[PDB]
Amino acid sequence: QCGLPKLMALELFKPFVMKRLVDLNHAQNIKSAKRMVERQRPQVWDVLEEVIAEHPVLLNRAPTLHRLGIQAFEPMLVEGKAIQLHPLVCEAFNADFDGDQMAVHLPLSAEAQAEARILMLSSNNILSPASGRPLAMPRLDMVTGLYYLTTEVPGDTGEYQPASGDHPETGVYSSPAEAIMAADRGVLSVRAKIKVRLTQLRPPVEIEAELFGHSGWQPGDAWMAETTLGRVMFNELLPLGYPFVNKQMHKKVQAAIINDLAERYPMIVVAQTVDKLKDAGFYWATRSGVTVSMADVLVPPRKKEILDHYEERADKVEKQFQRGALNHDERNEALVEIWKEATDEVGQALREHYPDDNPIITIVDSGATGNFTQTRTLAGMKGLVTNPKGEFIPRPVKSSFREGLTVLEYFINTHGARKGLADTALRTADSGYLTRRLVDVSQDVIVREHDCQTERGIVVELAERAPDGTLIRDPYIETSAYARTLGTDAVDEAGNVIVERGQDLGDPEIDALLAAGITQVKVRSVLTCATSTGVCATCYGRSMATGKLVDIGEAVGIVAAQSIGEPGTQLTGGLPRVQELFEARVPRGKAPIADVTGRVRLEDGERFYKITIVPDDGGEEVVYDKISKRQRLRVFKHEDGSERVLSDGDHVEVGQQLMEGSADPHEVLRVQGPREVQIHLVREVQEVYRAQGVSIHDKHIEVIVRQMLRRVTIIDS
Amino acid sequence: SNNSVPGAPNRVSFAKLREPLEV
Amino acid sequence: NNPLSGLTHKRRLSALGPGGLSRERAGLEVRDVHPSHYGRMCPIETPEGPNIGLIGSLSVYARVNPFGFIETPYRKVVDGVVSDEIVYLTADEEDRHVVAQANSPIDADGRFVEPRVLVRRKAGEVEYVPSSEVDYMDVSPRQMVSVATAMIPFLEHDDANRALMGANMQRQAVPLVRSEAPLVGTGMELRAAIDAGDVVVAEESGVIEEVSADYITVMHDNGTRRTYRMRKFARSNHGTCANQCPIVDAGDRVEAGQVIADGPCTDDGEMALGKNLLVAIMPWEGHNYEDAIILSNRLVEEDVLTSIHIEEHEIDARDTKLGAEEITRDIPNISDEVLADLDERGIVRIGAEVRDGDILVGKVTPKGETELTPEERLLRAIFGEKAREVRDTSLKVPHGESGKVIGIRVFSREDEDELPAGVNELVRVYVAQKRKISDGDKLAGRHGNKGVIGKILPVEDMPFLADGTPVDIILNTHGVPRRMNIGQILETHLGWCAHSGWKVDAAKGVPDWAARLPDELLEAQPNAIVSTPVFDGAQEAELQGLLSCTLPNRDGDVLVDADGKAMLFDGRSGEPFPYPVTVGYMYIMKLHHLVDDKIHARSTGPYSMITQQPLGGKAQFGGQRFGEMECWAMQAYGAAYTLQELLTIKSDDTVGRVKVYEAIVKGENIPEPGIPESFKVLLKELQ
Amino acid sequence: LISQRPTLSEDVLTDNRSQFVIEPLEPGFGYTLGNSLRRTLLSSIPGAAVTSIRIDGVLHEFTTVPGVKEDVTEIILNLKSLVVSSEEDEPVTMYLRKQGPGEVTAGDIVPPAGVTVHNPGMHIATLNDKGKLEVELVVERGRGYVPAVQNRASGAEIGRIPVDSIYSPVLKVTYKVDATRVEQRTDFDKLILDVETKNSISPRDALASAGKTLVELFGLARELN
Amino acid sequence: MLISQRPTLSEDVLTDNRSQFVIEPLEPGFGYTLGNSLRRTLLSSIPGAAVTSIRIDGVLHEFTTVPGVKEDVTEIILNLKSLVVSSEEDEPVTMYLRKQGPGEVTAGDIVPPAGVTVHNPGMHIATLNDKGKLEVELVVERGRGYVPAVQNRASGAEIGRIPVDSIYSPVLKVTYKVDATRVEQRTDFDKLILDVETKNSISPRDALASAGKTLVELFGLARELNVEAEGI
Amino acid sequence: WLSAASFQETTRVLTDAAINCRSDKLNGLKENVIIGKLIPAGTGINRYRNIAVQPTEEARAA
Amino acid sequence: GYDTPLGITNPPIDELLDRVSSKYALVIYAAKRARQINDYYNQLGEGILEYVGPLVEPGLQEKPLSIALREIHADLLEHTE
Ligand SMILES: [Zn+2]
């Protein structure tokens, strides 16, 4: 739902209102019905309610970065002149309430109303089409309110007490309604550990097995739980049929719960559940006592001592510059390290001095908003500030914003503040330019086939193997392994296959191969999809927004381009590196590569660097010429030692990176083949996006890379 | 007192530093 | 918008224009702060749009020499001795010396307390330096900031990002019906209001002979009389109400240079850009989600955030090819009910309230017979109305406008007034509206804390204090520690101390926290005014102590604690809130971003003649632009029919838009989209 | 432990402020009773206020009267502070004529039969030698707060100036409860309601109006289905 | 004042002992004024009888385990606390519950003295082990709301008697919310939704009616002061 | 050429388009956006576009 | 196994995607059926061969889109891809 003003709806639905005004005989003809609407006769307010009944509208906020920037809603006539937006869709629009405006579009045709009702409805788009993780979820007040009641407090009133002496066990209630009454009178606290007999909540699958196990828990069967009343009230919203969770509701916990709900439970249930969560989170955020005062801003106890130790060290380095023992370019770096150590000591003092009852710490620990760096600048110290040059000033801002900056400290802080504001416009400009380039390069990439039937795919590193044994989960599972589809049956050491070919890799289906010992899977990819133009759905995989297999006809290319271009606002490598990669430029790094596998012949000097390679099979020695300003990459030598600096005698393979930097993507193709250069580009872009906190599935990058190698040149006609 | 020159309302300043030159 | 906006606009330093630079030829080095801008151009006040850094504001004490460079004053320190001799230095003259920071500990004789003091040096180097090296020192701590920047209390506790926004939004304040001076001030309000030029200062000393709402007469000592006329309900450049009101009464001895009357955003001679509101910092049922602001309906019932807005409408009667446009009450096919608010000339009468669509000036234009639609000629035949060769071209009230007609001005060529050639008459009508605070009106403080009104609850739903007094505004806690604008918090504390007053324990000497405070601060009455100058003023050690000795209410009990919090009651249920809440008084301004102006909607209307697409902007009754990025969202959804609908029948299509309107008013289905006219234009241009 | 029928006792502090103690009440019950009474008091207590005014020399709010120090807007803001009670419950007209010099106050108004001004010392205007003020004031009777009635909605002609009407006679209401939390067989809450009016009615009359309101309203649950 | 008409009460029966009532439509914003009041009146001011303290033969200074039955002490206390019972005596009444031999105890195997009534005879209480015997004394008292445990610490005699939480109130769980309805133009009229789940002592209808009667008396205390007019 | 002339280098694309006399088959998202046709994606492809719906023989007696 | 769908979410978006192959085909099904129902409502008084009326019982002043969606949920229609 969305709340739009009555005066807006009257003009937006003006012809429909005139139609119904001439139908109900409030107006003689359509000509006078128009005048009735223009003069706002009191009958139009009763007619307009009938008009807008179940007629969806489209809400939009510029800039429209991704497809969720325009969403369909059911209009509800509200007074006033402002548009009422749902608190959960604020993340998709990136819309704060500090003066933002939105546009409303009215679909007229039946096909447009159907597209808005089914394809564009906000309740049908909970997940991000880029990552698959939910967006309509508790974010600020909601997650704090849920974090409140799901907190286990020891000394809280009404807590459980073991039976000792003449009194029995204190703090065991027969019904959650009895616990509600006890908290009503003032005996029990909603956050106190107690034992409750529950009858309408499925126990955890751990304990449901020991109680029943043979049959699933039944609505009506009772069981004991050592929880808080607030945790029971929270679990009442999931609701029945879902295993009880006795955890503390951090944002990560709630996000995992909602992801698991989207995977297993249907869409309408997910929408109604997150609405319940919104309401409860607001209710308990009102009563969580979250407040900011000058008293809550606690200052470090050893502020003076810490800053005096580091001022002593800084004075010693300044005296080591007085005698000329330190270069002027080195004095700044030394003082920078000094103050970077000092700021860490101050923040560490803050962490232990601050209690967990302090609301400033509660807000940040909940994960709703704010960093602890912000709290450190708030109470501890600002630290080293940046001048418009770029390097840190050799003198930090020792005072905190609670203490109060001096004149010169404020003046030097502005140096960084203003330029941080200034370069943002240019960075967003280049980001949007790259976004529209990515749009035009993949605009005609549509899913036209169900299955191209090609058994080709690619090997994905599921899990790394620890040196002692066992298994270690790989960091690239979320972006490169999940939501994929198989092109080869996974075979463990036994003859039985765990997951069939062509099965969507769900969440438990990854643990199925994890607990099976196999650490490599061959999956279908959009790169290996052999089709005339578009790509088949089987090689694409699971649609991140729909949670299922991609339907035929979905413009996956535009979705991928928007998925890459939306986080482009958060870059430094950086954004020009992404541009170097997507434009197939000869990179700045210009790292060399091994054209032929064989034996290394390092003929290093100081005037220059030269390296030859003796081919392992036939051929002749291949000689290079590189500047001594680079350094060799620690190549995983055949010795199984990854930190093997490339010296002569190492056994490097074909297409192996020699020195550090960025290998020319044009040469990787003419060395290893079109199959490998695409993987290189994919994970090279994924590194830039991962070094910033942005998780983009490799599917969307592969969609773009497929369009770069669609063309070949002609050597002979 | 603060700005005791035109006859304005008496706003009480928390000032520790004297004003050597007026605006 | 307000006097401060005009003062700032008069103190602008723009790098754009002829002789300067083009916007496309400006790197990130022309816009950032330069160390020579100290005391000359403000490093805070600058827009955050495309003109960031290109437009600055002159510092307070700065001036210009006849060469063109900006000079700033400094106190000359001979040999570690502070002298009252002040000299102005240019930018390069300042580099040939070293100057000490304004907040230096100084002996009563003038000698620096510490040998090494914080000193600025050429190429922007800040370091400790011996006392015998200081040649000059700053005049005031606020020497570097602008006038609007110096008006932010506790500015040293706000990051430059939000401080810039506070200074830039102070210029966007709207003059309210009545104005209140802020409890927490900086001292700059008075001089800002006076030098702005919107108040009425007395040129010569004397006594008030006759005071009226229209003029003020001053009888001087020599014997001459000077009369100052009040500017009452005048439309400003941006539609705000510039209204001056007398302050003095009959027979009041007034000195020279004293404010005898003040205009908009002024209270007793001080900048009153907003109101003192009782603020509580707590989330409330989600209605204050990420900077959304909940308001008490009291502010609506008592016109606390109500402002007057005046619009100017204008129309002319010209000479046409088939005759002359005439302004007359006789308009074809109009009842005597719509023309009831018009006089005998066809002009709306003074005092008549007019909604949108009402006729302000009845003008008819003669249209030729060869310009008639076939259906229109048949309709003229089937109604027998001959001699209606004129058509309606009257001045009507635009959509979204409503108020009282306060003034009419008529210029006629016949009346001997000079009009542009081809015009016989000209009429200007002034319409004034009294806008109360509404849902969505953008409020903000002085620390860059902006937000729209999310909900105006009834006065009984508000979280009220122990003595039943409900709060006026509910600010969300989550949007506080991110922005690093703790000033609004600190103000909120000091504000409360200004609302109640304080009394320091005089027994057993002066306490150890109020030793630095002036003796005037030890005792305060309720609703007292205080100054917190920029980079000076109240310290946290003194504010914490002030919170402990707050004055009790009329019943005798203290409401807030030494932590600055008080116990609140949920007005919707009755149970007290489980934890104390920071409650104080904050200065909130009504910015010129009201939903009464920013709301717009369109079914159909005018289309640009060339491209045959709907007009742009609200003033031209245009529609929203479904831009290039939005079509990508449409395509990513796969909603083909919605996109095709937007591109043709809803907008460009010449015949598709008409048959769609017909299909709606007939109850039929929506027809099939045609070919856009803009594409035809593209082909004819390629030809 | 068993019921005792509650008792309401009145204490007076001034002529427009009274406390009301209700006891005994069940534990946890006093806060909600105090809140319900406070909400009905701050909103739905009947009272009289001025609907519109009419000054002879003016046609709208945004102008001045010759001789008076305050413009018409400031005069209307001063009239918004007026407290008045009406017996007619129908539109009636008060009149005010005053020739300067001198101060026009609320006592200078001559109310017709039924209505009366409750603070004759309120400042309205300052008039000099050339000042003459002639004002009509239409007083009706409603409840709560109503915005100024539009001239298009009413039949009032141009000269009439509508004003916002604040019909609530109560000024400030609060409460505090005392809870007997001694662990024993007998626990009870004592409610202390605090009511302050604006001399239009006495506090006990406003509490009685709120009591009739809530009796009639809670009577909706007693009727069976 | 002015007339405020058409506020009606409708009932939707979810279960035989659980109903949702809607008071609709109310003036803005009386839904919150009489919402929490109605809820607390239901939950804390309806006369009902419940178990105050018990005493199990064979349990003196341990309170850890009862020999001869599978359930321990607190587990017995729990399902004894949920025992519904209506007493017309208005005084503390002692009932005895005894059963021997292997099997199962029920709330129907109890013997109720004249005046009291057990409404859930099929409620499980304990499982009797082989050659098991159980004797227990229950005390039933009238009251309103929920009195905490260890509040009857002084009532229990110094002889293996344990006080328990006494759920006197016949209603178990009441919640309420407020939505928006509109007759005429403005769309901010209050609609109060009450969800009441009660025991089988009385139906939700009579519980709401009793709360209404008590509240009418409570506010008639204030109505009696002046009998001034007010819009209905 | 129509999808390229609306991206970058309008003149450089139009010149070579006129020289090589390229004819554009209007089958693409950008092109159909310009000319007003249904985009060949989502509900615009011929699979979902040309679909007939009829009641399943059964009908009410009234 | 869910709360009653209120407003535009009825029929549920999960059960409607069962009688259809994809999200994009349900749009066409419902839209063309809605056009059929609208043409029946506008050709009931005039013209023969009027389109087949609403198969389910319609609510008072119910939009043809909602009626078509309900009867799609009720398995009263066919399709032809
Ligand atoms: Zn494929």
Side-chain angles (χ1 to χ4, degrees), chain E residues 36-48:
Chain E
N36 194 26
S37 297
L38 274 176
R39 173 177 182 270
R40 201 58 72 106
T41 311
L42 290 165
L43 245 54
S44 302
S45 184
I46 304 185

Side-chain angles (χ1 to χ4, degrees), chain A residues 452 529-530 536 539:
Chain A
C452 67
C529 172
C536 71
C539 282

Side-chain angles (χ1 to χ4, degrees), chain A residues 451-454 524-526 528-531 535-540:
Chain A
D451 191 0
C452 67
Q453 307 295 340
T454 68
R524 305 279 291 272
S525 180
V526 70
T528 63
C529 172
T531 319
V535 307
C536 71
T538 296
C539 282
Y540 191 79

Side-chain angles (χ1 to χ4, degrees), chain C residues 424-442:
Chain C
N424 295 331
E425 211 167 1
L426 178 75
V427 179
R428 289 197 181 101
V429 179
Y430 293 173
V431 167
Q433 16 184 351
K434 196 174 186 178
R435 292 176 169 174
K436 289 174 165 54
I437 180 83
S438 300
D439 282 75
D441 278 4
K442 181 177 182 178

